[PDB]
Design a binder for this molecule. Structure first.
Ligand SMILES: Nc1ncnc2c1ncn2[C@@H]1O[C@H](COP(=O)(O)OP(=O)(O)OP(=O)(O)OP(=O)(O)OP(=O)(O)OC[C@H]2O[C@@H](n3cnc4c(N)ncnc43)[C@H](O)[C@@H]2O)[C@@H](O)[C@H]1O
Ligand SMILES: [Co+2]
Length: 214
């Protein structure tokens, strides 16, 4: 099973990807997580994203396309995968189409802009696994600790309010057109498209998605 998650920054894609990964046994491909990992480890493929993410700008299509191709070519992706934050632009989506990377579901997370800022300020992350929590809306079982490893959670470096707003502007300019892109694909029978209300509680969004995936 191959899935794309579409949605604005902070819409909850990473949150719901964990449940889909757990239940269907497919790896999460989060280009944001992969880029931050490459910066932290100084990997030749990705370390260039340091200054770009710090400026709250998008990374070149060329770099993330290469990262995704490398990641997809791994053993754990022959049985499907979930794309989280990719594709982010029309060229990235065209790059998948050119490579024959068809997908079974495209799932759009609808969240009003006005909710994004308050979500990000409360976000806490477990960098090794990409698991994310919210101190108010989705807290860990123990404050400041990852539910899985018990390790101390951190805050992402690019989560200042000004940076979130810059990322939302880029989303609407560059990424929102993917709604129509994949709606057209679904109308041609190439994928299943579904829009979910991302303002519901986490467990309810999970249930709505479970009803789609089966
Ligand atoms: N393909 C690409 N091309 C170019 N550049 C790329 C790229 N991919 C990455 N990059 C670069 O990398 C940077 C970061 O990318 P990325 O890592 O993708 O971050 P982002 O774009 O800011 O999106 P988020 O990860 O913040 O949103 P999310 O949907 O995962 O929300 P989450 O589940 O965390 O939830 C957010 C918060 O809300 C909470 N929450 C979740 N669900 C709910 C709910 N139902 N109710 C209440 N709160 C909730 C969570 O607890 C959490 O605290 C970009 O700026 C870009 O430069
Ligand atoms: Co995310």
């Amino acid at each position: 099973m191959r899935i794309i998650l579409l949605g604005a920054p902070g819409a909850g894609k990473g949150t719901q990807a964990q449940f889909i990964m757990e239940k269907y046994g497919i790896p999460q491909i989060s280009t944001g997580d992969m880029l931050r990992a490459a910066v932290k480890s100084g990997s030749e493929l990705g370390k260039q994203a340091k200054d770009i993410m710090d400026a709250c700008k998008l990374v070149t299509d060329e770099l993330v396309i290469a990262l995704v191709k490398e990641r997809i070519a791994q053993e754990d992706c022959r049985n499907g995968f979930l794309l989280d934050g990719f594709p982010r632009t029309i060229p990235q989506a065209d790059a998948m189409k050119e490579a024959g990377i068809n997908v079974d579901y495209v799932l759009e997370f609808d969240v009003p802009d006005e909710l994004i800022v308050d979500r990000i300020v409360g976000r806490r992350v477990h960098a090794p696994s990409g698991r994310v929590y919210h101190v108010k809306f989705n807290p860990p079982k123990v404050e400041g600790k990852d539910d899985v490893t018990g390790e101390e959670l951190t805050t992402r470096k690019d989560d200042q309010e000004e940076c979130v707003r810059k990322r939302l502007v880029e989303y609407h300019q560059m990424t929102a057109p993917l709604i129509g892109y994949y709606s057209k694909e679904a109308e041609a029978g190439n994928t299943k498209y579904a829009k979910v209300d991302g303002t519901k509680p986490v467990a309810e969004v999970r249930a709505d998605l479970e009803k789609i995936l089966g």
